[model samples]
Target chain A: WQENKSWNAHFTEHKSQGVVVLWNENKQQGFTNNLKRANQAFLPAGTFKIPNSLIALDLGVVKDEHQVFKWDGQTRDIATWNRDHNLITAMKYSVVPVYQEFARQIGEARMSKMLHAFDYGNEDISGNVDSFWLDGGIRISATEQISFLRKLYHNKLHVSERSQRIVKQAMLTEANGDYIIRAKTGYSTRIEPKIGWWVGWVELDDNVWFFAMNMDMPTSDGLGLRQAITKEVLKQEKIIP
Target chain B: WQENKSWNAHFTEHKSQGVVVLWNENKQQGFTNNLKRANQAFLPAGTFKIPNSLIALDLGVVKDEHQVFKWDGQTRDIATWNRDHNLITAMKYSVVPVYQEFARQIGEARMSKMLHAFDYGNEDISGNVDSFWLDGGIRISATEQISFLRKLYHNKLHVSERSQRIVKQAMLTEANGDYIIRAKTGYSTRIEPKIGWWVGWVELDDNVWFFAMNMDMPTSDGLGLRQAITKEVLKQEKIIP
Candidate 1:
């Protein structure tokens, strides 16, 4: 609801895109780039990895952050993921197979219950256990993403501190002199005009800013675009730099 | 000069900034963020190092790119420049002291004549031999930067072919599957509302686009901002997507 014409203009200039920025600096405030899509739901895509990391850790599906998951001998187009990975390396490389293994080990019952408890996007994990966030039933809006991130930022979610800390640790993406950024990029190419998402927070000296951006991308370049646009928006907001 | 309203809008939003984009797709084209400032001269700042590299090579101030400048006993705030550096590493790290040595070696008369011959920024390198681009005299507009960059891209400068090639190779900043970026960032804090710059060209499969951005920054954070804005603008132009 805390809107700025310039910020919104920056977002919509890209054909089909939406952004919501929420910050808690003494008080809670935010804004949405596209009012229409602010509340509309789209597939969560790879962003589900963040929550999945938390869920897997809390459920003890993985022993610890360093617990390695061996490659199943299945080849991936992404060569980086063909080898074994632990939670840190898996998240760092965005290895899909490793997380899929965590999901399979966690099982449908625990995973579904945890999703409901977290109130994640529509709370539906009802397709193949391995690919729900990709082709299955979880969807979320830009605004909803901010709300979820707010909970995570303040450790308000029912999950243990250890689980939240581990996931946030794994999410640590970039650290510059002025700010530290913890975020994730989500891309679901299974759908047309692929949904690309970047959700994260910038921790400055005394304030924290949370942002979620989802846009329609026609190609895999969306992966880079998501991070590019989000970082620019954060700069525009003076949250970083 | 290539012109696009979106690009201009992006630049103008910064309030005290100017940008010029020139590209050779089939012909030279570009536009300015603020036409007035694009043509209004400002100190060339650290960006002068790009041409300085060429001048040094052409004058044989140093034997070649591999020629190393030994570090003086003096300590610099930037630890990266404390050690000896050759042309590639000097340009890679933007070592000021090493370039100062080059300026001292090139001397006043030859350097001034070379600046005039190149038609660089008011064609003045008057004042302290080593600080012409810093505290001395050397000013350029964003438009002029585009012109200079275009010349470098095409090897039209009067410098020897080997000189141009060596400097360009040293100027090489980044290369990726999509595009190769050759550019430099310059900052001058001696003045109020510090001058920050990022000037470069993006090389796509079939085209080359040159860009120059100069903005008024009140703090050091402008270092990251310049590159961030330029990269985003390049992406918007579909030059680096």
Candidate 2:
């Protein structure tokens, strides 16, 4: 559970004021760039898509991987989202509208109850149902993300196994023979000190390592640097290639 | 190293005559559907691309990933192969001609020395160098495939780190955050008994499980069943999702 002081160099190299928390469940160990920021709460942002997708699947708001959501024919900033998407593609492209539709279906009452039951991040869904996880009131610390993600990985979440399995599969960003990287990215550009996030786990030789990284990407802060910094630190630790 | 008799059910359900060998490196254990077939030799087929790519990269036959091989404006059976491809794309489509070109570059004398050094199967690279793995003469057993793959995974191959790393990355077929499936599939429809092969490793939990499955596809054997049976057995073993 020691703080890895040298990991801060990755943040410094990125010129970012950020934090990284890596919890090795197998070794019962932890590594962090900043202990203080690791424990501080920040807007969950789109990274909440992990749980949000889990809830959508559980409630049957989205039927299954093959279920399609109509694209409404509206052109969006993200050109990839303009077409119809099945559940898997929506998760891959992180289509905002598709997720918003699912949030509306979940309704405020049930999402609140599920968040509490799952013990997620301050358990706050203060804003409108669709925006809370994005522009809404919910917040989570890096440490809490580790706990929540660990539960999901272990199928220990209060949700059904099928729900967890599907979301788990959807979160797969990197699957190679030597390793697996299942993660979600979050960005809250509306805030004064805009926040960028990357959270997920790495399945390596004999253990699954969970990590959560966030940065105060205020000015030229990154969409890629959020992951770049995290990956560099993980590479330094020899956790991944 | 004990064989699990029940694992045969997976092959049975697929309605195919096949064999699977799962070697658990963590426990130094092995699981198999059929021990006899697991040890039987067969043409290395496209699966040989793993080592061939290594040799090509090591000898500087092909440059880095960005190096492009021009499409000769010749339409081939596989639509994807007709166009230009770099090393990664060439590997992805299993471009036979692209691999054959690399084999010719390796030449017989050096290719022979490298094969002996790799300790790959029986080290038999008979016939012309360009077609040995495909239409010519070269064979490897499932058990042997596991050893060769293990060496590659551990970076113990008689090749440079850059070569090893590039192949490993290119070998990645599925990249999920939860788990990874690094594998190669081979089909030699022209040969007698028409062999179909799926050989690779699965990274799950705390261990790397290496598997080699070859099915005797005399008639309706498969392009899909080659991997279907392999994946089914892995799923039954809970090695992959």
Candidate 3:
């Protein structure tokens, strides 16, 4: 529950201003590298796809998790984005246009409504309704990120049970015998000191630990550092081995 | 909680397919003209000013209710919009430019964010951020309309207590020795058959009732009929005398 002052070493060694919020649900404990920064909000970037995925499902815009969403013929920044995808593939690859198309379909009205229902960040789908969480607007704090993950874990959000289950399933990032991690990494290259987010929870038998981390990416390498630094903290904290 | 068939006569007499959702909080019951239509969503139009007012105050875009917002002197359809106004006066006249100016200052990001927080309609500030509620996007059902008013009445929405109080205070539409009414009326001319909204709550000692009614505006007379129909229903229901 106390601020983990020792975790500051991780950000110091990485040469960036960063914050992490980690919570243990059963123990009712929280760990933060920087409490002040944990409470601060920032652009959610691709992390927003988590909620967008849920919205698409609840609104029936995407018929089902496996329904393929065809990529437009137009090119995009990421090479993989040029191909079609379903919920699982799109989320795993962090497909921008796939979710952007979802935004276009869900439209701004319902999108904002659902976000508020989830109490996600500032819930501002400003800028292009699709890109607001990227370079546009809408920011969530590390604390808020973990809070959202907790709700997802418990299936307590306003989204339907099936939608939540599908999204939680889609967020699966790493799976192993010892521990399973469901997370998303977001790299925002649009702004200076571009931000990166690594958010999700690690599920263990009989216990769960949720973690959300964000940092300033002063250089290209920091993109990897989002998870790199996060893993280091988790290892030291023993949330992951 | 059941639909009140008797209210159908009111809309039929007016030559409009109107629906009214009236909730008596004290009695833990609701009255609706048409359950099907009550559940349907429609553009909120100027009725959105209710939340816009709260956003302006919570964001400090307009300092308190007395700050004079000077008009740009641009000629407009409404004469009152050409002059300066404070919050109460602007809301009273439903001054478009004044609230639009507030929207500009609040910007799209915060505006969309606040709307989501308010859980107002579809939370879509699409089209033009400043005028989305007018004709762009964002819709609510008569039921949703009543739900929002209930929150405003209780000051339970995410907006600051002071902001909620100020907005509720500004919404005072009619006051009498016996009772008080706080509400808003919206007329949308952009869409076919148009649409009219009369929403808010009426308070009497030890009891309160909320009413939200929306209907087609087939002709100019429907604008006045927004309140006319509502008043008649309120009298028949005996919520107001």
Candidate 4:
């Protein structure tokens, strides 16, 4: 499993510092990893912005749902910013104020339940989505992350089927062979970048697949080694094949 | 896990007798027997009869497939004298002629394909189900035999939503607790009496279940010893619990 000396050695030394790596270690000729336990409830922080956006679309609270709010060159310190921005830009740029504004306008109570259903982190959203822990939601597992991503891949999440497709289409980074990968990345604080998270799914000709990997590292620089290792693992697996 | 004299002695003997017994004498829970190349392909002889009958019921090929057949007063062979048999009864007795007749009628060709779908004996049964050695039909791993029987306990080869209910009704024996069992007994090659097989599944409870044993021994005399060893293994577990 550890043919790559660099990744293997890195994994040996600092894996316990809080990093978790999940990959198809045996070369992927058979079944895909089920992400069996990744998505346990955890504090999602900016991650919860995903569910918040979909909830807004579903409630008919927004006209185009893509209605952009342009940021004014001014400071309001508002509860979720009211700046002009679209959903895709909000996500790609990690626009915290943008998500906070959408949550604020949608009525905290409704957004609360939606986040609860997504079950971010180890704890349920006990309060309104706006009132929920803003310091990064709760602790979640790799399994839960994968399960939710699979639901996203299958277009089974909170938004209308059409909007979910748009959201997914907007999120995809690359497409090769039969697989179009849609994903999100997250980072936390530690000695380094804390936890580096990549949650996504792969679509094959006959089947769709999902996976999540979290690399806990001493620093952001150490995380590059982790990504290099994982990319090699995927390349060797011909997972894109 | 052969800690006792009987298990240890049996392990050594099985190894010497051309059985591929893996004996980790230095460790507990480390003894195993590999399958013989030829015996691994044994006809399943009559063991395949059970599912064949179920398939008859499932496919609507035979209405009330459970209709019982009796031993006609005439006999071509002594061992074939199992009388007054229905599907369950025929299975319990390992009646070859009744199953073989129906199997041949079912077109030995089709049965081979079904066997291959389950990856039976690592042989491809695409062309010849009716002819032996020409095509395949349900050769089994002792592990797979145990698995097939366990599915019956869990209900019928993982198909038919209500199959488990029917399967539970068939598993009438309660050794103790809610430990209900359903099983079939098989013996092939009288000249050698080499594989006296008793494969079955037992449900200890809704969640606690196990695939029972599939034993291939040197003679019919060895069947008793196998039973005794199994009983002790169970006894030890219960005593620990």
Candidate 5:
């Protein structure tokens, strides 16, 4: 369940290599003990978007794959990737407005429903307001997240499989090399802009595994994560211990 | 963490020889798992008094411990324990009003806080009403209840040790043994109660341990738990196992 580059990258960039991984591939699930600290809280950035999408779809407020919502094009900061897009495109590109709109529509009631159902890491969506759809940042260790992702893939949530699949697809837009993977990328302000998150489904052989990886720091704009963390962590995890 | 009763008490008077206690003696907590089921969502009856007290106290609405709220003292036709009383007295007698009021004060905010912090079995609360204290019937597996009790002993919940100790003392009022045990009893609303709970704290060799215990059907209230289930299941456990 782990690759060499992933581990090497974690060690290289974080300047401290403290990682714990649980793998029961036969069970199609794994747990990671420490991603940020020793049994402490850490921010789960944009990876939350996956659940955000699920909440939107399940509540009947948004009809399905083609549900449309407009991005006012008011860039909080500059739009780096997909700009002013609808739900599908926004999900693929992780566009803020698309998710932001769903977050608002779901409001606290529906938002709480999805998060509570999934046992969202942080239940304190204190700042969940109008345009500020991305509050209540949850706290999750890699172990908890892996278990959650596994639950999603197993369709054990008892909700619609189509809804789960849609969110799964958005997070994981690409498939490369040996496996067809469904994943999501999350980056946010709680820890620092330097956080890069990739949490989603990974298919290997007859099994599909789920995992979350995040990188953050004191500075803003986590641009260094791809080269410095994500690529390397994935590589190492794919290999041996 | 266990109790030794006479066989006559078990077969004749309908009492088990012993209870399968989940005891983290180091933490002054324990629980019983008599049915051989995994610690799933066992509902709360009258034992949700602790959280209820916290809610009342935090809200400043109840001016005194003796401030009684009456509920005709008439038992519910289905579940006899479902009637009224004061916060302190209700807790002492395992009354439902105390829990209802307590849950109301905390609302979802504080209730979920207590739920997640204490690691309630399956983090989602069962019901929706703020006043539905113990709604979703506060549940915990034998394992989880013990952990929660242990946290209380360790004063890890940010509540004062004295306050926790007070609750502990109140709980011990009706304990089954001479183990300096503190516990709560519960009876749900079935024609014949299906679940019985005993959760509390214990002291052993300079360390305080916590525990939770549960008894269930098809082993009815009168028909005692077969002793083999004790040896094969509970005896193997660390405390009462």
Candidate 6:
């Protein structure tokens, strides 16, 4: 069931926003706000990289997570991606070119097969193969994102244990004495109105909490707000402190 | 009524420590560890300056919260006290000589009367006027510290409203969008098994949470641990995010 009043009040202050937190203990238990918008499928955007990274690892598209891919000597507007990158830095820097290269190497057949098997958001890899997530060929709702993260966290996906572990390891964002947070932030700026996504889980001594949040951000600073709002929601839920 | 287990486990990791958090709500609900240890009287040390500042303001000894006290040309082991100082800088720098001068100017008779009226810890000021809080004759428990802060926060103290507001304003330690924290730290290193204190309240959107923490520190770094631990506890309690 949704804990919508407070969350809805918080997000309704802005134009468009959605948030969902799922406990690993039971499937029926979770919290949500604006479920209609949360269930509305939007472009999967950079979050597709999480599944792409897993597929690349499982099929030997990349030998290992540390396998470095040399830069193609191409410069871009984003300064962070102007250099060579491996899986860690690629994910860390959110380098689009690196994952595009992985898609080309993984090929349409295997990549499509993996997405189909994973039942990933619409399972559509059509349109411009490299820009499917960015250009709106594939889509996923906030609900599916949390489901995908749940499978990834519990290693329930068909991928090898090492592949899942390696991908999960690469997602390590922050760690402290209290808890460790593994999350990925995504922003779809190429679209008309910007969409920001923050999806991840918090690992505690004996439990885990999965969270997925997206919001309409008219400005670049809104990119940081996705994680900020998720953290606020998590703190309100006592999943994190 | 007490959630001592988590709080106790948190502090027992160190040698000796006590903490108390009180909410300003009608419930009178709070959390604490080592109630005996938290209730045991210990020297207030520099923390006494909180009330001392108020007393100095209420009396004509200090013209205003902004009044400057010229250096008495008295030099001590600490170098910050050797120059002219105002209330803000005096509190910021912990200029003992300046506040000690205020204690002297306010005189023992008036100071004793004020302390007695406020029911300050142990109601004793028989020791040297300048070093009463430093050496002996005045003591306070971690519990008492929270009580005094609670009263001050609510403007319930018998002092003038201006005096309370000025002292609270002078204690302004940190402020940001989410919350504002007013606090003062005290270190009693002169005694064996040195003591460190971090006492403050976090002002949130609709509530205030007061915290008092003290610990035994064997080294210089221990002086900073009180605030560190208290902050960590506050974070755990979700009082300050």
Pick by lDDT: which candidate is best? 2
**Leading candidate by TM-score:** 2
Candidate 4, position A13, lDDT: 52
lDDT of 6 at B195: 78
Error of 4 at A241 (Å): 6.7
- All-Cα superposition RMSD per candidate: 16.9, 18.8, 21.2, 22.1, 21.4, 23.0
Candidate 4: chain B TM-score against the reference chain B:
0.66
Native-vs-model 1 lDDT?
0.76
Q: Candidate 3 clashing pairs?
A: A109-B122, A109-B124
Candidate 2 on B1-241: residue-level lDDT in tens? Answer: 5677687776677676778899998888888877888899888888999999999999999877657888878898889888888876777778988998899889998899999989988898987788888656678899999999999877799998668767876677775544567788888676676888888888653468998988877664356787777777788887777
Candidate 4 residue lDDT tens string, A48-106? 55566667667765544346767865666553343555665566555666666677788
| TM-scores vs. true structure, each candidate | 0.50, 0.56, 0.50, 0.40, 0.43, 0.50
Q: Please state the error at residue A10 of candidate 6 in Å.
A: 2.7
Q: What is the lDDT of candidate 3?
A: 0.82
Candidate 1 residues lying further than 4 Å off, grouped into runs, are: A12-16, B1-241
Give one digit per residue, the lDDT tens place, for model 1 in B188-226. Answer: 887554788888887653467787888777777556768
* Model 4 C-alpha lDDT per residue in residues B33-112, reported as the tens digit of each score: 33442134444544555556555545544444245565655565646444555554455445665665556666655555
Residue-by-residue lDDT tens digits, candidate 5, A50-155: 6777777788766665455555756565453334444545655566666676777888776666767787665546565433333445566556666677777665
lDDT of 5 at B236: 46
* CA displacement after TM-score superposition, residue A166 of candidate 6 (Å): 0.6
> What is residue A1's positional error in candidate 5, in angstroms?
12
Ten residues in a row with the worst lDDT in model 6 chain A? A19-28
Between 2 and 5, whose lDDT is larger? 2
Candidate 6 global TM-score: 0.50
**Best of the two (4, 5) by TM-score:** 5
**Taking the tens digit of each residue's C-alpha lDDT, what string does model 6 give over A141-203?**
887888888888767888986677668756766654355577777777776557878778876
Q: C-alpha displacement of B64 in model 2, angstroms?
A: 40
